[PDB]
Every structure is written in C-alpha cells, then in structure tokens.
Amino acid sequence: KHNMKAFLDELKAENIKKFLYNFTQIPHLAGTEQNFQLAKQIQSQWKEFGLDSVELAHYDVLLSYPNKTHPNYISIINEDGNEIFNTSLFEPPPPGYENVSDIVPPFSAFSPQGMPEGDLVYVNYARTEDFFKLERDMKINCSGKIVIARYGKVFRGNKVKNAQLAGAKGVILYSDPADYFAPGVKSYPDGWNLPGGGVQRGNILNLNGAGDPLTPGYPANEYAYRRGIAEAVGLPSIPVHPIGYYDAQKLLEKMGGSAPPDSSWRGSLKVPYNVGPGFTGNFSTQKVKMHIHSTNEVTRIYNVIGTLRGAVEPDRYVILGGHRDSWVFGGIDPQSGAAVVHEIVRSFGTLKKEGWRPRRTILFASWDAEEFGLLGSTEWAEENSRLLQERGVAYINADSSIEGNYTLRVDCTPLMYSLVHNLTKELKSPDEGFEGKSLYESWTKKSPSPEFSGMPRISKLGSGNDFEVFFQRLGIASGRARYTKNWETNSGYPLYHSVYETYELVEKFYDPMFKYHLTVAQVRGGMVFELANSIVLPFDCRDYAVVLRKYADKIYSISMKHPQEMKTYSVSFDSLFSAVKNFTEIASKFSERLQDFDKSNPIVLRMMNDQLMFLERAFIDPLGLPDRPFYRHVIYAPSSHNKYAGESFPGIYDALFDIESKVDPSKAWGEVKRQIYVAAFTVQAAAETLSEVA
Amino acid sequence: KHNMKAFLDELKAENIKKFLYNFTQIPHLAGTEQNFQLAKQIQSQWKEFGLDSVELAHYDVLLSYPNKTHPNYISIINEDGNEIFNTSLFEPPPPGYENVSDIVPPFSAFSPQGMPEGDLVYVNYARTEDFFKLERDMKINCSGKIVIARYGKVFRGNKVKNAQLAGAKGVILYSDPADYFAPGVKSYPDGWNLPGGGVQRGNILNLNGAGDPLTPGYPANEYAYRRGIAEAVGLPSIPVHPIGYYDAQKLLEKMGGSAPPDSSWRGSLKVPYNVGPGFTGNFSTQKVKMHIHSTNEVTRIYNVIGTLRGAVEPDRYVILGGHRDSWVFGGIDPQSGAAVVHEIVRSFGTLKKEGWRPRRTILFASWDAEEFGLLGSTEWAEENSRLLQERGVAYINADSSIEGNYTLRVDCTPLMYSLVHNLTKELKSPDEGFEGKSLYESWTKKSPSPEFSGMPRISKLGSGNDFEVFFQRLGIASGRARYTKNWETNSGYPLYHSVYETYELVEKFYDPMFKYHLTVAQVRGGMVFELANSIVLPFDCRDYAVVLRKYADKIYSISMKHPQEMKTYSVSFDSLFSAVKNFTEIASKFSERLQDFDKSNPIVLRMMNDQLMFLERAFIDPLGLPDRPFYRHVIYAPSSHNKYAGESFPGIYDALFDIESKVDPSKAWGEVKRQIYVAAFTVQAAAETLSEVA
Ligand SMILES: *[C@@H]1O[C@H](CO)[C@@H](O[C@@H]2O[C@H](CO)[C@@H](O[C@@H]3O[C@H](CO[C@H]4O[C@H](CO)[C@@H](O)[C@H](O)[C@@H]4O)[C@@H](O)[C@H](O[C@H]4O[C@H](CO)[C@@H](O)[C@H](O)[C@@H]4O)[C@@H]3O)[C@H](O)[C@H]2NC(C)=O)[C@H](O)[C@H]1NC(C)=O
Ligand SMILES: *[C@@H]1O[C@H](CO)[C@@H](O[C@@H]2O[C@H](CO)[C@@H](O[C@@H]3O[C@H](CO[C@H]4O[C@H](CO)[C@@H](O)[C@H](O)[C@@H]4O)[C@@H](O)[C@H](O[C@H]4O[C@H](CO)[C@@H](O)[C@H](O)[C@@H]4O)[C@@H]3O)[C@H](O)[C@H]2NC(C)=O)[C@H](O)[C@H]1NC(C)=O
Numbered sequence A, B: 001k002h003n004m005k006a007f008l009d010e011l012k013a014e015n016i017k018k019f020l021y022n023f024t025q026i027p028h029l030a031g032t033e034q035n036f037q038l039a040k041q042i043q044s045q046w047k048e049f050g051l052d053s054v055e056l057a058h059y060d061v062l063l064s065y066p067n068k069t070h071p072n073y074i075s076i077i078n079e080d081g082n083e084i085f086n087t088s089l090f091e092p093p094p095p096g097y098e099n100v101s102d103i104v105p106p107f108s109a110f111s112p113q114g115m116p117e118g119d120l121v122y123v124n125y126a127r128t129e130d131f132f133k134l135e136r137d138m139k140i141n142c143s144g145k146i147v148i149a150r151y152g153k154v155f156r157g158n159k160v161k162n163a164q165l166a167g168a169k170g171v172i173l174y175s176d177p178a179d180y181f182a183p184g185v186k187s188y189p190d191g192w193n194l195p196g197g198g199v200q201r202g203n204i205l206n207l208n209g210a211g212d213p214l215t216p217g218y219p220a221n222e223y224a225y226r227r228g229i230a231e232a233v234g235l236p237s238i239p240v241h242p243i244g245y246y247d248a249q250k251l252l253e254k255m256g257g258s259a260p261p262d263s264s265w266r267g268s269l270k271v272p273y274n275v276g277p278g279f280t281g282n283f284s285t286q287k288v289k290m291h292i293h294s295t296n297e298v299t300r301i302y303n304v305i306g307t308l309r310g311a312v313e314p315d316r317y318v319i320l321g322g323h324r325d326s327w328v329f330g331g332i333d334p335q336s337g338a339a340v341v342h343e344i345v346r347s348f349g350t351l352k353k354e355g356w357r358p359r360r361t362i363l364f365a366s367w368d369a370e371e372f373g374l375l376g377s378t379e380w381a382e383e384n385s386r387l388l389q390e391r392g393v394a395y396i397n398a399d400s401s402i403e404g405n406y407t408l409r410v411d412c413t414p415l416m417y418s419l420v421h422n423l424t425k426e427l428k429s430p431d432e433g434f435e436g437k438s439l440y441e442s443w444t445k446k447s448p449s450p451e452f453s454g455m456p457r458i459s460k461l462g463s464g465n466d467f468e469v470f471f472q473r474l475g476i477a478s479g480r481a482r483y484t485k486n487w488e489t490n491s492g493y494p495l496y497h498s499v500y501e502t503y504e505l506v507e508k509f510y511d512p513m514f515k516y517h518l519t520v521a522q523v524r525g526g527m528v529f530e531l532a533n534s535i536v537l538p539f540d541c542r543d544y545a546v547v548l549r550k551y552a553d554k555i556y557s558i559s560m561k562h563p564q565e566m567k568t569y570s571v572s573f574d575s576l577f578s579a580v581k582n583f584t585e586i587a588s589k590f591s592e593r594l595q596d597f598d599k600s601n602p603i604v605l606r607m608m609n610d611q612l613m614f615l616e617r618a619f620i621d622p623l624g625l626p627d628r629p630f631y632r633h634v635i636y637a638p639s640s641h642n643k644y645a646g647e648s649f650p651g652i653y654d655a656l657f658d659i660e661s662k663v664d665p666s667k668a669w670g671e672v673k674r675q676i677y678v679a680a681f682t683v684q685a686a687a688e689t690l691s692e693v694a
C-alpha cells in the first residue's frame, strides 16, 4: 500500500545525518556564492528525488554585511582618546574549521554606520518594562547614552526599537551566561554551552511583516521600483553591535551610578550590574565608543521551489517550507530542519516513482535570506499572493528540528490541533523510558497543557520565522514542530547564531542517533501527508471555538483592571462574547454536516473543503492592524513588544496596553471599543463562512 | 424545456408596467417609513414568487435631510441686508400629485449648515479644467467667494471638492437648459424636458468607495463603533444648494467682472455668463447669501436579500442587484430598474415552482440608500465580504432601465463582452425599423464601437452606482445595461432627480408599450441566467488581453507627451507591455485548455471555473490605490475628476496628471515609475492565475 505508513517508514535517521553533514561544511550566508551553489544542489537533487518541477525563484533584496577591510568593534576610550580596550574582531573558530574562509564576523545586520561615544546605561533585556522601570521608577534618562543590553526574553529588534525610542545613541548586545550557559555543562567543543568569546549574530529590523525593506507589498523582481533608504521599512537609526560575555565583562565591570533595582536585573557575571549612567569615580572620565562600518546593499537571493502535482486537486497547495541560508555553518539553524525537509522530499519522491501522487499538490520550499528578515519567503509570497490566497491549504514550517532533546514542541493554528493529536498517537516516542509508547504519551507527560488533563501543550504561533507571511499576512493555516529542552529545569539553545553551531555540535551533544530528527521528520512529514491526502481536510473548526472563548475571557480580564473607565466610557465586551458563542454554535452544526454529508458527492465535498480552507482566511482584515498593514489576522499577531511571541486579539490588547498612561483617556478608550467592534465583527464573519452557503 | 428561452418568454411588458405604477405612487426616500413599507412588500412578494429565502438586512447609516421647519434657500441681499430675491422653497408639484405629502424639497444631501454671504463667481461645470482656466489663465481667485456652477459633465461631488479646494465658501448648483432642455421638446407634463422651476437633487459626498461615512471598512450594524462627524469620510466642508434655471437666471443676470473666456462657458440662458467675481456696477454692493439648515443623522436603512439556491454549485453566487430608495417618486430612477428586477424574480420563480433550480445560486437584492452614497450595497458587502470574495461569480446591476428610447447601452468588464454579444444576437430588437432583426444588429448599427467594424460600443464601468463595492473594492466581475438616448444628436435625462420623474413620464413619453423595459429585462435577466447556469462560466479571458493592450498604449501615449522627462528619469513602460504580452499568451493557452479539457471531470471543471471566477479578483491590490483604500482594482477606478467615468490604469494616470505642474519633478516621475511597476506586476500576476496550476 501507498499510505501514510509507507511514507513514514521510508524516512531514515541515517539519511538525515548524511544530509546535515553535507549542508554544514561551509558557511551559507544569504547572498553569497556558496549559498547559490547549495541552492543549485538542492534543486538538482529534488529533481533526482522525483518532483515534477523544481525551480529557482530569485529576488533582489536589501541585505547587510560588515566591511571586510574596516572591522566593527567597540572600545573603552580614555580622556585623551586612547582606546584602552577593544572587543574582539571575530569568534575563535572551532576545532578543525580554523582555516575555513568566509566566516562572517559577529555583527548586527542592518545597523547603520557610526562611531558614537558616550556613557553606558545598562538596561537589562531592554524590554518595554525594563525601560518603564528605568524611566518611570528610577528616573534614569537614556537620552544620548549608549545602552548595553543582554540578549534574551524578546526579539533583538524589539530591544533596539525600545532603546531608540528612549533616545539611546547606540546599542550593545551581549550574551550573559545567566541566559546562555547551562549549569554543569561545558563550553563548546567539550559541551553545548556558549564560550566567553562566542557571539550571537542576527538582524535588528522591525519589519512588521513587510519583507524586503525597499519593496513592501510587491516582489523585489527585476523591474521593481525601490524606495530610497531613507523611506525603507524597519531600519534602525542607531548603531548596534553584539559581543560575548568575556568582552561584556570588561564593559560592565566599571559601571557606576545607580544599583540594579532588583535581582531580576542581575546576570551571572562577577560585576555589580549597576545601571549607570557611566563608570564609577576613578574611571568616570572614560567613555565607550562604537565603530560600525557595515553596509546595506541590494543582493540577489534564491529560493528553491519544488512541486509535486496532486492527482485529484492539483489546484490545492500544501506547503512545506524552511530556510537554507545560515549565519555560518547552520548546524542547528537551519540545516537540521533543511536535512529533514530533504529526506521528506526523498520519501515522497520514492512513493511517486512507484506511481503514487498525493490528492492535493505539495509545494516544497528552500527559502533564502530568512536570517535577514524572512525575505525569501515573503517576496515569493508577495509574488504569488493571488495563488496562495485562493489555493493555499496549509503551511508547515521546517526550520531547526532540534533545540533540545527533552520533548516535542508544536506551535500551530487551532485548526491543526486535532490533526497533531491524532498523528502523534500513531507515532513512536523516541524518548528514553518511553520505548514502545506513543509520541503523544511522552509529549503529554513531559509537556502538559495548562488547560486540559491528558493533553499536550500546543502554543500559538508568533513570528520570527518563515510562516509569518503565510499565516499573519495571508491567513493560511500554519504550523511548526521540533524537539526542545525542558523549560522547568532550563533564551533558546546556547550556541544560537554562533560560529560554534556545527555538525559536531549536533552529532555529539544533541542527537547522535538522529532519532529526534527522525521523529520531527515524521511529525512534519506526517502533517503534510494528511493535509495533502485526506479526503476531508483535517481541520476541526470547533478547536477554534474553544480558544476564541479563552482569548475573549483573557482580553476581557485585562480590560477589567479599569472598571471605572469601563463604566465611564461604556466599554462592553458583549458583542465579542456573542460572536464567539455564535462561532461555537455554527461550528458545531458545521461539524455535524461534515460528518453526515453525502460522501459520494465531490461538489459537496469541495464546498465543504473550501469552507475549511477559507476559515483561517476569514480572520484576515484587509485593512490590517493599526500601523502594521502586513499583520492582517485579527485573532493572532506577533507581540508589538516581542516579535517571537504570539498575541491573541492583538488589536484590543495593544489598545489596552499601558492605557492608564495615555493623556486623553476618552480617545484611548474609544479605540478600545473600536477594536472590540473589529474583533466581534471578524469572529462573526468567520463563523458565517461555516453556515450553509445558500 | 426549462432553458433560457423559457425564462425569457415568461417575462411580460405588462407586468413591468404594473410593478412600476405600484412602486411610484408615493415617495420612497431612504430612511423613511414609506421606504420600509415598500421593502416589506418587496420581501413578501419575492417569497410568493418562489425564492427560497427572503430577508431584510438593515444598517444604521449617516443620512441627511432638510429641516422641515427651517427651509433652505438662497437670497440676493442688499447693502442694508434686505433679501430682495429668494430662490424657491419647493418644486411646483406635478399634476395630480399637488397633494402628495412628504415630497422632500430640493437639497444637496450632506451639506453642512451655514449662512455664508459673498460675491459670486461662475465656474462653468466646476471641472478640474474649469478651475485651471479660472486660476491659471484668467487669474480669478475663488477664495472666500460663493461659486455657482452648472450641473453636467461630472459627478456633483467632484464639483464641490474642486470648489472647496479653490477656497470657495459655498456652492450653488443649477440646471442650465443647455444641458437639461432638449430642443423642440416641451417641459413636463407636456413633454420630457425640465421646467424652469425643476431642480436636481443629489448627494455631494466624496466617499471614494467607503460607504457609510462613519463606519469605513466594517458594516454599520448594531454594535458598530462610529467615527465622530469631524473624522467622517467624504463630507463637504462648505454649504451647497441646487436650484432651477428660473432662479439661476436671477442670480446670474447681474454678474460682472470678466467675460466668459469662450463659448464653451456659455449656456442657453439670456445672460452674459460673466465669471465675476460679483455683480456689475449698479449692483456691485449686492451680495448672495445662502441659508442651509439640513442635518446629518444616523438612520436605519433596509436591503431586501432574496436567495434562489443553486442545484449543483450552491456556494457560487450570481447577484442581480439594484436600489429601491428614490429622491421622490423615482419613476425612472430607480423604479424602472426595480420593476424589471421584480419581474425577473417572478420569472425565475415560475421555473422554480415547476421544479427547476439554476446550477449556481442567484442572489437578488433591493438596495437601500443608494442615493445617499451607495450605502446599502456597500454595508451589505462589507458585512459579507469573505463570502463574496471566495464565492462571488458576478454582479449585474439593475438601476434605471431607460434613460432614452434610442438604443442599448452596456458597461461591463471585458470578461462579459462575449456573453453580451452572444446574448444580444439571440434577442429581438424592439426598435422601429428593425422588426425581425436581432438586438445585436440594431445596437451595433446605432452604437458602433470605435475599435471594430460590425461590433457595438461597450464602455468601461465607472462608478456612481451599486456595483462599485463589488467591482472596484472586491473584484467581482460586474456589468450593467439599459436603453439610452442618441448621444450624436443629444448630462443624462432632463428630469433626473426631480419631482417630475413619475410613472406618467415613463408611460407617456419614454416607453408606452414597455418594450424597451422588456428588452432590458431580457438582457439583464439573460446575463444572470447564463452566469448562473452555463456549465463553464461565460467569461472570455482573451477579451481582457485585448483591452489591456489598448490601455497600455493609451497610458504610454500620455506619458510620451513628456519625452525629455522620460529620458532624464529613465521612465520605461517595457515591463507593462511585457506583462500584457504574457497575459495574452497565457490567456490564449488557457482558452485552448478550456475548450479541450475533459468535459466529464467535475474537479477539472470546478478548477477551471475557479480560475475564471478569480481572474477579475486577481486585479485587486490589497493596498488599494493612493489615498483611496477602497478602490483596489488596478485596471479600473472611478476617475479622480469624475466619479461617473471609469479610468484605466488609474494609478499611473493620476501619477501623470498635471505632472508638469509638480514642484519636485524627480519625486513625481518616481511615482509614475512606481505605479508602472505596480501595474505590470498585477497584470503578470493575474495572467499567472490562468497558468496550469501545478
Ligand atoms: C449572534 O447571532 C445572533 C443570531 O441568532 C445575532 O442576533 C441578532 O442580533 C441583532 C442585534 O442584537 C438583532 O438585531 C435587532 O434586529 C431587530 C430586527 O430583527 C428582525 O428583523 C430583521 C430584519 O431587519 C430580521 O433579520 C431578524 O430575524 C428579525 O426578524 C431590530 O428591531 C432591533 O433594533 C431595535 O432594537 C434595538 C435594540 O434595543 C435598538 O437599538 C434599535 O434602535 C431598534 O429599536 C435590532 O437591530 C437581530 O435581529 C438578531 N438576528 C437574529 C437572526 O436573531 C447576533 O447579532 C450575533 N452576534 C453578533 C456579534 O453578530
Ligand atoms: C513575461 O514572461 C517571461 C517568461 O517567458 C518573463 O521572462 C523572464 O524575464 C526575467 C526578467 O526579464 C528573466 O530574468 C532573468 O533571470 C536570469 C536567470 O534566469 C534563469 O534562471 C532562473 C532561476 O533564477 C529561471 O527561472 C529562468 O528560467 C532562467 O533559467 C538572470 O540571470 C537575469 O539577471 C541577470 O541579467 C539581468 C538583465 O540584464 C541583470 O539585471 C542581472 O543583474 C543579472 O545579471 C534576469 O533576472 C527570467 O529568467 C525570464 N523568465 C523566463 C522563465 O524566461 C518576463 O519577466 C515576464 N514579464 C513580466 C512583466 O513579468
């Protein structure tokens, strides 16, 4: 038989291991020749693997690179302008790679050039609340200061935005061992910890879904008209640079002014974690000076797009996508995901060579420039947005397969909750102590949902990966899955975006048998297989009804901290609760029909599959969210304070956020009520797409 | 047989006549009780006629009405402030209706209140070019003046916008016999001309597709959050009032200052048509004073929505829609269209009672408040936008069936050009001298296309009617058809929006046998029948390819009046021409497949029908056009200078318009190039939806 089991059994741990080794010997930085060569290899192998067509789609997008002959670094500088301390120019390369060329040194992509000089302020994680504490409670003013912030908690782009709105004239990011050094584990190469000379690369944009900074809305193709840099989306206005904790120690050890306000501001280095501004008495004349000479430039990028045509509904697309570009070797990020995709493709290709075709079309993508802002995925989707909005069933992301070895982690739309539960009950747990038990069992045991006994945690989708354009802009049901660490006893993985992220890191310390990879390949691949082959689409609209009520209760509770204002301005959540009730009733009746409808009738079947496909789509507002036109989903957006975190009812959440500080409360509560109306309407409207159609 | 011929033969001239008489005995002003009663009647009769369901959808929208106890009027006022001349307070009611109550006096809906006083300037039709002539060439400054403008040429809302941007402090609109009195024909009741005391009502909004001024984007339902009046969309900021030519004569006869610049500025009254400002010497101390006390208020409106469920594709909607609200009796506008719809419904209802059902679902609509800005249609579509965008096949409008008795007039998307040609060859001409000939033959004879021998003129869709939200916002293929006058020998019909528009006007002077009405019922009804029943959707994508090339040539030629700037800024149309070539090739290959595809396969059939349905949709840009977010179609928008006229490639047109006057030519030509990119991309993208899907 050619069924899911056949698909699944053809996947091999040993193949994934080979592919990963193959994808991680040299750096594959976006826009470089090496990453173009890997694209051509992937294309040629997907063809050999059996796909009907395999094409490169290229775009010319804004990227960012250091100047090879004019290195970035930071200094402590004295009263005379002598540079008495310099941060490192590169990370010590790992064993055996000390002669690899083209290792991009640590930098913050998209930072403007500058050599600002000033006194440091230390701002913890540079969260919204860290700045509130600093400005409101401690009365420290960051205006014209250089801020130094530790990585962690939120997306680094948010930290930079926060710093910039506080008036900072530069930002230094560093990795504190509190957040990137696990107790009892050694530094790379003898363990999986971050060494003191290790540094986290990454872009510091605030794109809010735009894609290429120069071409929002439209693909960056050969005739594209581009904005001037000054009107580009999302670029930071102050210089930024990241450093390791050996260097950070040297910058922080002399810090004076105020003490930290509490222990949640103290990391693990042997320094006071004073907030500043500036250095203690003896050194108070010393300053910090940054030197940033990176350039932004328009560079060609390449996605690989593979098609396996569906036998029955070729005009319905299930997409499996993940990026190929890496900061350096990409041993975890992304090649551990990409090797998984490669083997998924090979397995589907095997079935196809024996004459099988999935019911719906499967598209496979190797995205480029994800690291520079989700650019490849976003441009491709801007190009193909009409096809995707009318034909797109689902998007399964395929970045890093592992960030730990403890249990499964799934973030997805409610519409896939049942699919995921069912698929996992049929998969074997790879975990020690769960031999012969199901993946569902071990996952549920180790990661219980807060809401329900005997069910696993499944989180909402945020952003910071290639599903963003599909889910938040276009409204295509999306999900992701990987193996992760135990949060209870234990920022993501310590060697994230460091030169130390290598094949060896994975083979030695994360997944030597490649069994966690194989399980992730089964989850991802299994999702795609069911999406593309089940006669009725494997979405359950009732799971949306359940979370919608939870979100409505949550956002109501937030509002209810201001009872006086809710009375004075007549702020009611009745309409939202009403819409959610209707959605629950209508969804329940639709499921009955979906179960009882006449199975013989393909039109009836297509009608009802269309209603399931268009349900996620129904949550899109074409006007977008306030000031964020590419975040169009009304139920989910990335948090305005942390791009990685999903927010529910974001329109209302943001209108409520810090509302007690607004100077015109009438206007602010007005906007709360506007967003309630928007949400209630959209929920009712989505429910109506599940009513009998005529 | 239950086929089109059966449908068509069941339609009766005598029935239309009865319905029209029934719909025109009392006024049916939007928001009044009488118009609610008619809605309930229409609902109850559509039910009797056989429809599966018939519902009222209501909304609470901003309307506008005069103050019953504080009448609007205009005065000539002297140095002492005596009002020595007053315009009329009402039109002389027609014979036999002099005791009808509730005839709304002439007014400009949505005018703000005020009593400004000042000197007149006469601005011809108050077109963009009339103001250019006035300001640029004649050096006349309208700032702080009251302008007086003759109706005609463009939508009155545009005139008011133009006046307002020239600094006018009020506007007076009047009907000149040059534009509303046909030579040799008598005034109402003895002919179809406009009497001197007749006045044209109508709104003066600039909504640009928004609908209800207070709720852009979302339906004006029970929990809607509304903008404050100050932030409302489209309201004029200066008072406005319309008058007849008896009154206008009195205002214009004393006019001094400059002479008219040429004879295209002179109407037919016995006055000099001096531009002013102000009156000639003796009277130069006299002023004009307006008194406007109308109020805007939120008022409930009611659409009637009838459904005839499709037998095979119930989830595909063909919509026949037209408004029910009138300024007064609505003898032409809208009841001559509404009576036609009523009889269409009855005929489809007859077939249904004998067991027939169309293949696709047919929705029938009686829209409310069209006269106050397309409000009923727009709100309903905002409410149901998800259903309409994924299920909407086509929209056929059904306002006035006649504005003349000479020939057929069709405006539609290119996708319906073939359908219209074919249907008309099968219909009988009702014209004198074409007995036993086809409608196509007489129409083609009397209204030849400029482009092709042996074909009729079909115009592009503009706006100023209820198809706007469907076509320009949502991208649903749309069309309209009526009988019209001969433009060669002969502003629309003289009694437009006047109390004189009555049943008698129609029965005596336009269509005594009701044969033009019957023909329009066959065209409209026939379109709907084919749309709803043909196995393959009756659209021909190649007709779009042909006009796209014509539009590209046209917009290229406009640009080519500035060859020097096209060189200096590198302005190329290559990408647009390339996209149009690709669209032509791809469309040609798609038609071959549509003809040769395997007829047995319903999925293949649904795929290809989906591609035809989504083709109009593909021209939508979700970002909209510049500053007009509800005009989203890239190929067609209403002219920024005249809401009634369609513009092709409006983004590029507007970027080119008056470009020689812009102060930063680099920036202006930049935006030209941006819009070219937008257009070329969208055309390519639309063509790609017609490629093999996988
Ligand atoms: C969740 O789902 C339910 C459907 O079960 C929706 O319930 C509707 O609720 C709205 C508003 O609450 C009701 O609105 C009211 O409509 C009355 C007229 O209703 C009838 O006539 C219409 C045709 O216009 C029919 O469609 C309908 O079936 C009824 O026959 C109005 O008279 C009401 O207005 C008056 O009272 C209100 C309230 O005080 C005043 O403000 C007004 O000024 C006026 O006096 C009112 O507008 C509606 O009828 C209900 N529909 C149905 C089918 O039951 C919920 O709205 C929906 N939730 C959300 C969020 O959408
Ligand atoms: C109308 O339809 C045709 C399809 O027939 C489109 O033609 C395409 O035109 C674009 C731009 O004109 C071509 O773009 C060029 O692509 C080259 C690479 O193409 C190959 O490799 C790709 C994968 O990336 C394959 O998809 C493709 O089939 C080819 O195998 C680039 O090398 C070119 O860039 C270089 O030259 C240009 C031009 O001077 C320089 O600016 C660059 O810097 C670089 O040196 C270029 O980008 C494309 O290949 C054509 N496609 C096909 C299938 O033929 C039209 O674009 C379309 N019209 C519109 C408006 O969309």
Ligand SMILES: *[C@@H]1O[C@H](CO)[C@@H](O[C@@H]2O[C@H](CO)[C@@H](O)[C@H](O)[C@H]2NC(C)=O)[C@H](O)[C@H]1NC(C)=O
Residues within 6 Å of the ligand: A021, A022, A025, A040, A041, A044, A045
């Ligand atoms: C990764 O694997 C690929 C393919 O198996 C290797 O590329 C092949 O290498 C040789 C050149 O030595 C050629 O003869 C083949 O044509 C290549 N195939 C393709 C599809 O490119 C590649 O060498 C491997 N890379 C590493 C670092 O091991």
Ligand SMILES: *[C@@H]1O[C@H](CO)[C@@H](O[C@@H]2O[C@H](CO)[C@@H](O)[C@H](O)[C@H]2NC(C)=O)[C@H](O)[C@H]1NC(C)=O
Residues within 6 Å of the ligand: A067, A068, A069, A070, A295
């Ligand atoms: C990278 O920095 C280098 C070296 O400091 C820059 O090269 C210099 O640029 C100036 C003026 O543009 C020249 O006069 C010098 O002769 C150049 N020096 C060298 C060694 O070439 C270069 O401009 C920068 N590169 C980028 C991409 O900005």
Ligand SMILES: *[C@@H]1O[C@H](CO)[C@@H](O[C@@H]2O[C@H](CO)[C@@H](O)[C@H](O)[C@H]2NC(C)=O)[C@H](O)[C@H]1NC(C)=O
Residues within 6 Å of the ligand: A075, A081, A082, A083, A084, A085, A086
């Ligand atoms: C930190 O780096 C700077 C820049 O390379 C060093 O300062 C330079 O030193 C050379 C030789 O001593 C001088 O000719 C340059 O003029 C200096 N440039 C600047 C900008 O200061 C500095 O010595 C280094 N400091 C440490 C402690 O290593």
Ligand SMILES: *[C@@H]1O[C@H](CO)[C@@H](O[C@@H]2O[C@H](CO)[C@@H](O)[C@H](O)[C@H]2NC(C)=O)[C@H](O)[C@H]1NC(C)=O
Residues within 6 Å of the ligand: A418, A419, A422, A537, A538, A539, A540, A595
């Ligand atoms: C997950 O599997 C459950 C349990 O088998 C499926 O629910 C059953 O589905 C069939 C409909 O074909 C019903 O007849 C059973 O009554 C359902 N059982 C229960 C308890 O609901 C569920 O459909 C699967 N989910 C998905 C997306 O496939």
Ligand SMILES: *[C@@H]1O[C@H](CO)[C@@H](O[C@@H]2O[C@H](CO)[C@@H](O)[C@H](O)[C@H]2NC(C)=O)[C@H](O)[C@H]1NC(C)=O
Residues within 6 Å of the ligand: B021, B022, B025, B040, B041, B044, B045
């Ligand atoms: C328009 O036609 C309708 C229906 O044929 C008339 O309404 C009917 O009038 C009588 C009241 O005299 C009632 O018994 C029926 O119930 C009404 N029917 C409906 C559906 O409303 C109406 O009188 C006519 N109007 C005019 C002005 O002639």
Ligand SMILES: *[C@@H]1O[C@H](CO)[C@@H](O[C@@H]2O[C@H](CO)[C@@H](O)[C@H](O)[C@H]2NC(C)=O)[C@H](O)[C@H]1NC(C)=O
Residues within 6 Å of the ligand: B067, B068, B069, B070, B295
């Ligand atoms: C219409 O105009 C009338 C009459 O000129 C207005 O009624 C007057 O309003 C003022 C203050 O609001 C009262 O003191 C007068 O007593 C009222 N006069 C009468 C005759 O009632 C009325 O306000 C206006 N109507 C609307 C809808 O604006």
Ligand SMILES: *[C@@H]1O[C@H](CO)[C@@H](O[C@@H]2O[C@H](CO)[C@@H](O)[C@H](O)[C@H]2NC(C)=O)[C@H](O)[C@H]1NC(C)=O
Residues within 6 Å of the ligand: B075, B081, B082, B083, B084, B085, B086
């Ligand atoms: C035009 O209308 C105005 C308003 O009705 C008339 O002026 C009023 O006349 C009465 C009685 O003569 C006075 O008590 C009012 O004070 C006047 N009001 C104003 C605002 O002037 C005027 O007479 C009419 N003019 C003509 C020529 O008919």
Ligand SMILES: *[C@@H]1O[C@H](CO)[C@@H](O[C@@H]2O[C@H](CO)[C@@H](O)[C@H](O)[C@H]2NC(C)=O)[C@H](O)[C@H]1NC(C)=O
Residues within 6 Å of the ligand: B418, B419, B422, B537, B538, B539, B540, B595
């Ligand atoms: C209008 O009628 C024409 C002429 O009959 C139709 O074109 C024919 O359609 C069939 C496809 O079923 C072809 O086999 C013929 O070869 C076509 N003839 C020509 C000259 O094209 C055309 O399809 C009709 N248009 C619509 C929308 O129905």
Ligand SMILES: *[C@@H]1O[C@H](CO)[C@@H](O)[C@H](O)[C@H]1NC(C)=O
Residues within 6 Å of the ligand: A141, A142, A143, A144
């Ligand atoms: C912070 O410092 C800057 C510059 O000296 C000043 O303009 C700004 O007002 C200060 N903010 C506060 C809250 O004192």
Ligand SMILES: *[C@@H]1O[C@H](CO)[C@@H](O)[C@H](O)[C@H]1NC(C)=O
Residues within 6 Å of the ligand: A192, A404, A405, A485, A509, A510
């Ligand atoms: C692998 O598993 C064991 C759990 O028992 C753990 O102690 C080790 O830390 C894990 N490796 C990584 C990289 O987390």
Ligand SMILES: *[C@@H]1O[C@H](CO)[C@@H](O)[C@H](O)[C@H]1NC(C)=O
Residues within 6 Å of the ligand: B141, B142, B143, B144
């Ligand atoms: C028109 O008149 C106003 C007011 O007196 C003035 O502000 C404006 O500049 C004038 N325009 C021109 C072109 O003279």
Ligand SMILES: *[C@@H]1O[C@H](CO)[C@@H](O)[C@H](O)[C@H]1NC(C)=O
Residues within 6 Å of the ligand: B192, B404, B405, B485, B509, B510
């Ligand atoms: C009706 O037809 C004749 C055309 O011969 C024309 O003279 C008359 O003006 C027409 N009626 C109207 C209202 O146009």
Ligand SMILES: [Ca+2]
Residues within 6 Å of the ligand: A210, A211, A212, A214, A215, A216, A217, A218, A219, A220, A378, A379, A382
């Ligand atoms: Ca772009």
Ligand SMILES: [Ca+2]
Residues within 6 Å of the ligand: B210, B211, B212, B214, B215, B216, B217, B218, B219, B220, B378, B379, B382
């Ligand atoms: Ca609205």
Ligand SMILES: [Cl-]
Residues within 6 Å of the ligand: A397, A398, A399, A400, A465, A480, A481, A482
């Ligand atoms: Cl992922």
Ligand SMILES: [Cl-]
Residues within 6 Å of the ligand: B397, B398, B399, B400, B465, B480, B481, B482
């Ligand atoms: Cl019409």
